[PDB]
Structure formats: C-alpha cells, structure tokens
Symmetry: C5
Subunit: 304 residues, 5 copies
C-alpha cells in the first residue's frame, strides 16, 4: 500500500481525536501517568471511493492490512502504545474513519513548586512523519475529543481535556513531522494535607517553644525528622526548590536557631551574666512565632 | 466475516457471564485487583444453523477465525485482558456458545472512609460497540455468573458476585455502546487491627497519660510523641493517606492534638509552679489527669457517630 | 483436529506428570511461588496407530499443530504458564507421549499461625474441561512425577512432591472438569530466627526489667519501647501481619502489654516514693521485679500450648 | 536475502545515526537509563538500483522483509531494543535509507566519586557482525545524530550527544565486529543539595558543638548522632553507597569520626573534673569549642583538594 | 525436520560456547543475576554436506527453520532465554556453526557465610534432551568460551569464566540428558565496608563503653541500643538475613549481647552502690571498662578463626 495521491499538491490532512476512557497511576516521582483511550483518525482516500446506488451499501468496512493507514505515533511515551483496532469505516466519497482503543505510559513533567496546592497540564503529543510521495499533516476533530464522566485520577480534580488545534509542523531528519498537543488539566485535592501532614509536623515545631531544656528542645528535631521519614512518601525532593522544600529549609533553621538561643541562654547565665539572660530568653518566646509568620508569609508571596 | 443479519430490525443480543476462578492482589494503594475468570458469550447467528438429522451431529465446533465473534471489551482494565478461547459451540438453530478463560488487572475505586471496618463493591464493566451493519446489546445469563468456592481474597470476606441485569446503552462517537456492570462485594477482616495496630497506638498515648500523676513529664511526654510517629512509621503499611478524610485519618489526627494539648498542659504546669504560684499548679495538673481519658472517648465517640 | 473417538463410551484418560526443575521466589506477602518444570501428558489416539514393519520406525514424532492435544490448564496460576513443547512421540498403538517445559507463578495460600516454625503444602492444580464430542479425565503417572535433586527453595526444606492420584471430577458451566492436586511439602529453616530476630527482640524486654530495681526508671523504662518498635520496624521484613492471629503476632502483642504494665509500675512506684507513701512502695516494686520474668515465662508457655 | 556484493573488495559501510526523542529513568542504583530514539541506517545496494526516467519514480519504498537489511545490535542493553520501522527509502543509485523508532534500557556505569557535583558520559554502543559474504563496517552520519529540544532528564542538565566517529573494529568468534560509541554527556543540578541534604545534616554537627559550652552534655551530645543517622535514613534515597569511596561517602565518614571525637572530648572533660582536677577541665573543653569548626573546615577543604 | 542420522550408532556431539557480553543485576536477596551473551553451537549434519569446487560457495547460510537445530535449554533460568539467531553457517563436510545472542535471568545460589569478604561461583547450566532417533551429548569448545573486557559486575571483581569440559550425562523421564556447567567466578570489593558500614557500626557500641567511667550511664548506655538498631535499619540494604549464620550475622549478634552485658554491668554497679555497698562498686565498674574491649577483641578473633 502507498499513500493517497494528491489531487493538486496539497498535504494529506489526518483528523485526530482522543477520548479518555481511563486515567490512572499518576506517578509523581517517575513523572508518568497511564492512559487508556480511544484514538480516532480520519483522512480522504479517493482510491477507496464507491457509488452508493450501484454498491447498495452506504459504508464499507476494511481490515487494517487491506488499506493504507497513516503511521501516527506518540512523542512522550515510554514504549509504543498497546493498540487494538476497533473499527475502519469508508464512506462513498472515500473518507476513512479509523478507531482504535489504546493504552500508554506517558512521560509528562510536573511542576512541584506550589505542592500540595499545585495544578498541572499533562501532555499527550501526537505525531506523524511525511512520506516522499506526499506530506501528512494532523488536525483536531473537536467532536472526537473528550473524556468519560467516570475518568478519575485519585487525589486530583480533572478540569479539562483539550487539544491545541494548530499542529507544530517541523523538519526532522530531512522530512516533515506534524505534532499535535493534547492537554489534560488537573488540580490537587490539598484538603487532606492539613489534617495528616501540615498540622502534626507543626505541632512538633510549636512544641519546641536550663539543662532540662536540652532534653526538651532537641526532641522536637528527632521527631521532626521522624515525621519527615514517617511521611516522606508525600514530600517531594526536586532538582530545584519548592514552596515546601523551602518551608523545610525554614523548619531546619527554626529548630537550630531555637537551640542556638537555648545554647546561648544556658551559657550566658553560667559565664557570670544572669541579668541579660532573661532579656533574650523571654523576647525570643514571642519573637519566634512572629519571625515565623512573617517568613512563611514572605515565602508565600514569592512562590504561590 | 460480517455480523449476523437482523430478521426484522432488532439489535443483536449477546448474552454474557463471568465465572471467577481466582481473585488476587487487591492493591489498596493502586486501587486495582487482579482477576482470573471464565467469560461466556452467546448470540444467534442463523447463517450457522444446521439440520441435526442430515449432519449427524447435535453440536458444531468452530475455530475463532472461522466465524463472526462480537468484540467484547472491559472498560475499567489497565491493559486488555489476556484471553485464551476454551470452546466455541454452535447448536442446530445457530445459537453460538463462546467460552474463554481470561486474566485482567481491574481499576476499581475504594472508599477508605470506614477503614479498617470497610466494605467495597469492586466493578468489572463489560462493553460492546455497535457496527454500521447492526446494533449490539449485552445481556446477563445468570446461569453463567458465579464464583469458585476456593476464590479467596486474603484479608477480605467475599460476600457476592452479581451482575446488574440491565445494560447501560449510550452513544459514543456516533455509535451505540452497551455496558454491563458486574459487581464483586467484599467486607474487611478487621479482627487483626486491634491486636497489632489499634491497641498498641493507644498503649503509647495511655503511656503519655500515666505521667499526668515535673522534669519527668518531659521524658514521659516528649517520648510518647517520638514513639507515636515511630508506630506511625513502623506500621504505615496498614495506615491509608487519602485525598479526603477517613475515620482513622481523624482517629490519628485527634492523637496529634492530644499529644500536643498533653505537652501544653505539662508546659503550663511546670512553668506556673516555677513562677512562684505552686498552689494553682495541682489544680489543673490533677483534673487534666481524669479530663483527658473522658475528653478522648467523648471525641472518638463523637467521630464514630458521623462515619458509622 | 478433533478429539480421539471412544471405542465404547468411556472418557479419555490423560495421564499427567510434573517434574520440578526449579522452585523459586516464595513470596510470603503475595502468597505466590514461581515454578519451572516439565509437564508430561499421555493419551491414546487410535487414529495415529501405525505398523512399525511397514513404516520402518518404532515411533513417530509430531509437531503440536499436526495432531490433537488436550487443553490442560492450571487452576491456581496468576497468568497462563509460559510453555515450550520439548517433544511429541507417537507409538504404534496410538499412545501419544507429550512433554513441555513450562514456568508459572502459582497462587498458594500460606498458614502463618506457627511462623517461623511452620510447614506448608504448596498446591499446583491441573485441570481439563471436557469437550462436546467426549469427556476428558486426568490421571497421575507416578513414574513421571518428581523433582531435580538441586531444587532449592532458600529458607525452606523440601520434603516431598506428590500428587493426589484421584482427580476431582465435577460439573462447571454445563460441562465436566477433571482436577488433579500436585502438592509440594516444605518446612521452614527456623535456626536463624533466634540469632537475628528472637533474642534481640527479648534483650529489650529483658533490659526493661533490669530497671525494676527512680528518675532513671523514666529514661530506661520508656527507651525499651522506642527501641522495641525500632527492632520491630528495623526487621519488619521478617514479621508477618495476617488477617488472623499468629503465635508470633501474639508473641509481639504480649510485649506491647508487658512494655505498658512495666510503665504502669514505674509510674505507681514513682507516685508511691512520693505522695507520702514510701512504705508499701518497696512491697510491689520489688515483687514485680521477680514477678514478670515468671509472668512472661508462664504466658509465653501458655501461648505455646495453644498454637504449636 | 543476501548482502550486497562488493564492486571491488571494499567492506560495506553502514552509516548510522541516533536521534534522542526521550530520556528517562536514570536509575543510579541499577546504573541504567531508558532511551526512546530514532535509529537511522544507510548503505548502498546496487541490486535495488533503478532509472528514474523509465520508472517514473524518484524514490522506492520497501517493506523490511522485501530487501536485505544489516542486523544492527546494541552492546550495552539489558534486552534487545523494541523497534518499529518508520521508513525504508531507496534512491536511484540503490542507496537505502532506513529509519526506525526504538526504545531500550541501557547499561551505563556511573562514577559517583564527585556526587552530587558529578558529570557523566552515558554510552550507547552500536555494533554489527560481518557475514561470510562480506565485512560490514559502521560509520557516523553526523547529520542524523542529535536530540529533541524537549529531551529532559529530571535532576540532570543535558550537555551533549555526540558519537565517536571512528568505529572500533575487532574480531569476535571468527568474524569481524564494528562498534560505534554514542555518548550522551550529562551533569547534575547540585543547587538543591545544600537546602535539603548538605546543610540540615551539617546543622546536626553544628548543634553537637553548641554543647561544648556536664551530665547534661551526655544527653545533648549523643542526640546529634541519633538524629544524624535519622537525617541519613530519612534521606538515604539521595545518599550513595558505592563499592569504592566517594568524596560524599568520605564527607559522611568524617561526620562519624567528628560525632565520636566530640563525645570522646565530652567523655574526657566530664570525667577529669569529677576525678578531682577541675583546673585542666576548662583548658581542653573551651579549646575544642573553637578547635572543632576549624579542624572540620581544614579537613573538608583537605578532602575537597583531592577528589573534586 | 529430523535429527542427523548416525553413521554407526554414536551419539550426536553438540559443541557449545558462551561468550559474555554483559553481566548485571546480581540480586543478593533473589539470588539471581542477569546475563547477555552469545551462545555458539556446532554439530555435524551429513545431509547438509556439499562439494566446494562444484557449488562455488565455501559456506552456505541457512534460516533456523530450514535445517535441524538441537533444542538446547538452560537449567537454572527463571523463564526461557530471550534468543535471537545471529548466524547459521555450514562447511562443505556438513559441520553446522550456529550463533545466537541471548539474554537470561539466572538462578544461582550465593554463600553469604564470609560476607562482605566472600567469593562466589555463579553457574549457567546448559542442557539437551536426547531424541528417539538418537542421543545428543554436549561438549565445550574452549575457543568459543570467554567474556568481553568491558563485562562489569558492580561491587564485584570478575576472576574467570570457564566451563567444566565434561558433561553430566544422566537419565530423566526415560531419556538421556546431557548437562554442561559454565562457571563465572566473582569476589567482593570489601574496601567500602570499613568507611560506611564496618567502622561506624562499632563507634556506636564503642561509645557505649565511653560511659563505663553513674546516673548519666543510664541515659548514655541505653540510647546506644536505640542508635545501633538505627545504624542497622539505616544500612539494612547492606546487611544479609540468611537461613544459616554468617561472620557478620554473628558480628551483629555479638553486639546484641555486648549492648546487653554492658547494661547488665550498669544495672548492677549503679544498684550495688545505692544498696549500701559503694566499696565493691569501683572494683567491677572499672575492671569491665578494660575488660569489654579485650573480651570483644578475643571474641571477634575467635569468631574469625571459625568462619574466615
Ligand atoms: Cl505510540
Ligand atoms: Cl479487555
Ligand atoms: Cl496443553
Ligand atoms: Cl496454564
Ligand atoms: Cl536452541
Ligand atoms: Cl533457555
Ligand atoms: Ni493489542
Ligand atoms: Ni493468551
Ligand atoms: Ni515460550
Ligand atoms: Ni536492524
Ligand atoms: Ni514494537
Ligand atoms: Ni527475541
């Protein structure tokens, strides 16, 4: 089989559509998500045109091997999609309607800067390579883009599944490549964070505020690294900094500066000066909660 | 091959059945379970009808490629089911009886609100897409729905495996689609929870409460926090972190306040008696010692009222 | 191809055998084990009979597609076995001798009640479904059941690999099914447990009692709780959490009560050495110091009587 | 099919190119990375040559089975690449242009000596075995070597993707083998290390010294060891344990000596003042309080000079 | 296809060779290693013999399906090898030369008794089952056994890759089986251990002795058990739990007795001086402070004599 010949010179337009059936396994660490969807393709092949009056049939159904089908690939997939052809239908004018159900593991980067109050745009890039006979270009059939109502991504709210209607046409290894960007929009159900993560990690910090203070103020450090290890499956370590990987470098400083204060107050009163000891070791007791609110509100202004 | 032609205009009814052979790997985190079952399909294809007297046989056996077979798919599966055709039998009137043994990883959401005293309804959705030649509809053959007696799901009690007999017929991308809902009902085996998880998490906070009867309050208070997060680390494989709140997500969130209010009490009592007032020190440190166990069950009993 | 026709009415007997080549990955948590074995099958197909005088040869070798072969399946497997046909030999009477080497992931429940001093019977269930032409029944050829001497299952002693010679014949979805039970008996090599798990779990309970002899009782008594959960989660990969109770899930829950009742004492003795009651303080704090090693000895021996 | 015959004697030159589409899963522990790329191959096959005028076509497209294609393999791959042929184009002189999109798991050793300030050269080795008919040699078509702009490797900066243009030709099992070295060069994003890994672990060493200013020094000095190993376990997923020594494996090793020599000082100063000598006690306990931060900076700067 | 007929009665000799291309994933817990190698096979098939002057060709290349090829299998593999035929060459006398590149997950037991100063012999067992027509025996072609210079096994030193030249011929299920033993010899790069595991594991229970010089000894001696069990969990990925005992599984079990006997001495010295006897208190508390490092030195040297 060879591609449909052009009537003039025009490129062959392959109309596309993705209908999400399932979305699952959004792996934050691997920056992948699995998808199970319908992929619909439409193109005109005049060599397949027929007379409806003489044939008596409105539509003809073909086997994938019997006709020419465009080689559509996904850009950002780990391995090639697992695809099962559902249907191939040809109208009398020769317009082919292709439908396959596929599953794929998609590579899509995630921006964790605003975690756990972040929103993401997951991408599914469709691509086609041109043949020497003719150029193949991709288009979006908005009637065939969508999602099942039951599509659930645990811990996320699904907002929209849209496609950037204009393909990105470019040359790659001396041939044309037509790329479409399908985008799935999500937002984190951060409701849970306060209850289990935000509040109890803080009730360790808050519990951090003379030789007995050495056993007291150092525990709220040993337990902070245990809340960390005890819930690290929900804390992200990025190559850059997050508004939470910063709330982390602040708790580490705040747990230190508190034990710098209680290491200076219990050493100033012992080095013959107990007058100025109650001057800084009472002011830091109202200074810390306000130095914190100011700092966390200063951090918040930048990132979120 | 092409679908069987309609005698009038009627859609083709494909009778279905799922017989569970094995149920395994209920992954709470991934919200998946693996299934190994028989899938039975029945439909009328008049083009295959024969006379038993002339043929000499009462049944005819075909190879899947030799005849038309409906494209049945599962909705909520990770990848397509691994299927092996067991048998294809045709009766004299053209009634096809199809049987395959398949294995599949099923996506089925779990409600953890009542964990570990929860019950779930796992779903297996069967679906068929209609052809331009004719409309295909699914039906349940209750005689071919069931489960092996040996079907075991470790940590769960299997109640029932039934099917919603009425399919959900709907249009999708300009074609009819027929969807059936097979439901496997399961309740949890919560017996174990108290023994190793529920009771020992309490025997740390009761050991925070047996120090309200001081500098010793630090070594008894600040420890039954460090050890609570260590049972919470040491038994996290049994504790679920959901996007919402569970009756256990809260039953552990009350512990975070109770371990704090306990060290707010012992941070106010050991600071009031030191600031020249040891009279009112024994007034709050002694009532909080009988106040905490009653504030607790009142709270845990208040939580229990809403979730259960 | 179609099944061999019956001479009278009698079902077709398919003689079976499993020869274990490798046993590996006994996953206690998943309750699976992987197997690599030979599967031998024998049945009489008179249509394949030949004269050794005329054909010259005493045996005919066939390709799987060339002849009829019974569809033999495993019941308790996650997915279908990865099989490679080694040989198909047809003898003059028409007796077919089939041999394949397969590998499979087997689902076999494990009883952890006596862990780590437990023994198990792993099962491999062979099954065949009868066809419309005739009924198929399975049999055990004891000459073709066995295991390689090198078959090793790390951490276990392999006792025997036998088959229940009588198949379980039953009806399933309007057809006959013939099921054979192959059993691999294995026992646990518990020698290691004392050295790395049992003894140090105890040198923390023992070191909690070596402090029942006052402000130092706070630092000791509570540490041998924080360290107990560290030996636990520090070696949890060797401790099983079942839906039911084990003599080890019980051994580890008595420690939770003994670490608590040990800090019910260190809290009463600290309340008695104060609150103007010094006398009766040395009456219970000294008696509990000889009471518990024996209250423990009695309890663990009482537990042992029930389970093992 | 057979290889193209040589016009004189010359080996068949197969021009190669790898264009990276995706790079992912750089597994530091397994020393693997996954790749998804285009593989382009070009060679002259005169038997496929044609006249463009007489044929009416300027290019001829073939199916992989229709023509001879060189068996190109990757040396350092776990299993064989998953490949999908995109295009096969033949020009009038019979120059074949082959293009496939493949995915592969690549084995490439990583040097962790300078972690987290390390740079790596990941390799992809292309290889071809010669046939008896003729010798096949590999070449680099620099026009077909490259990477997509979007190629991202999380936690790494991608420097260059080049190929060593000269193949390594050698004999292996009585035939010639031609090997090309494709090098994807990378470097880390060490900015993050200070914030979350380097500084908090250092704050523990710093807070161990903020106690060199007597029985309370035992409870304070030993905690910043218990917490040191908790920062370690708490962030071990970012700390590498190699078969050799890393400047960080040494930086972690210096902390083990500095946390010991710190509690050797606080075990000698709190024992000298108690053994009737409190004069010389303030001589070493005060000098070590300004000695440690400078003995550390000197040591870490001495270590740094060697490795990085 | 059928096997080559014997000229007299002699068994067919299949000459073998394995050339290692890659060695990776030595999984200590699973007792597996992955291999990627060439497998070469040679046997005489007279039916394929040809005249060199008449044919014009000195070698004839065949497709695997075109000729008879011996079914060679690996004994100790999880699943069957992933194999890709590279070349099949026939010499005029009818000597076939077969070459395939395969990848396989090999089951090979590991002896951890001397860990981390252990050496291992990994095995790859090649096997052939004889056919009814004739007996097939395996041989080693030492010219075709070897390994690539780049073959690296992370954390191990590769010593040699040799084959036991004499096959183990035996009967299995009424047929002859010919088994060859290929051995890859490796040793552990134990240099790492001192740095990260060896010296720091000690410094914890070395720091338990730096407190045998009284009420502070309660707080210091007991957190040592808390930190040791954190150094252990903190580096458990490098400590092996075997069904048997090691020079390490004991080295870590002596520490459990030494961390206890340490707190038995402090549970006796800090209780004897308090129970009106402070004379004999300085007699045993000072002697145990020089007794422990020598009782340890002796014990570790006594242990060493047995195992290594
Ligand atoms: Cl794809
Ligand atoms: Cl499916
Ligand atoms: Cl079979
Ligand atoms: Cl099977
Ligand atoms: Cl082979
Ligand atoms: Cl194999
Ligand atoms: Ni498929
Ligand atoms: Ni299958
Ligand atoms: Ni196979
Ligand atoms: Ni190739
Ligand atoms: Ni492919
Ligand atoms: Ni292959």
């Amino acid at each position: 089989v060879s591609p449909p010949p052009p009537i003039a010179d025009e490129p062959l337009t392959v109309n596309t559509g993705i209908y999400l059936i399932e979305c699952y396994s959004l792996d934050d660490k691997a920056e992948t998500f699995k998808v199970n969807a319908f992929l619909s393709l439409s193109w005109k092949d005049r060599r397949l045109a027929f007379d409806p009056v003489r044939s008596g049939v409105r539509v003809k159904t073909y086997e994938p091997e019997a006709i020419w089908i465009p080689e559509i690939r996904f850009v950002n997939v780990e391995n090639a999609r697992d695809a099962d052809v559902v249907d191939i239908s040809v109208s009398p004018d020769g317009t082919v309607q292709y439908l396959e159900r596929f599953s794929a593991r998609v590579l899509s980067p995630l921006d964790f800067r605003r975690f756990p109050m972040d929103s993401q745009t997951l991408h599914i890039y469709l691509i086609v390579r041109s043949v020497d006979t003719r150029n193949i270009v991709l288009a979006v059939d908005l009637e065939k883009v969508g999602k099942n109502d039951d599509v659930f991504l645990t811990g996320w709210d699904i907002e929209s599944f849209t496609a950037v209607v204009k393909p990105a046409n470019f040359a790659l290894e001396d041939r044309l490549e037509s790329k479409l960007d399908y985008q799935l929009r999500i937002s984190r159900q951060m409701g849970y964070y306060l209850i289990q993560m935000y509040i109890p990690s803080l009730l360790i910090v808050i519990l951090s505020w003379a030789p007995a203070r050495v056993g007291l103020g150092i525990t709220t450090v040993l337990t902070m690294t245990t809340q960390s290890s005890g819930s690290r499956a929900s804390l992200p370590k990025v190559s850059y900094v997050k508004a939470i990987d910063i709330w982390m470098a602040v708790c580490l400083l705040f747990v230190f500066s508190a034990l710098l204060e209680y290491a200076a107050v219990n050493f100033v009163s012992r080095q013959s000066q107990p007058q100025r000891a109650k001057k800084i070791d009472k002011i830091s007791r109202i200074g810390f909660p306000m130095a914190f609110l100011i700092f966390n509100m200063f951090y918040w202004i930048i990132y979120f």
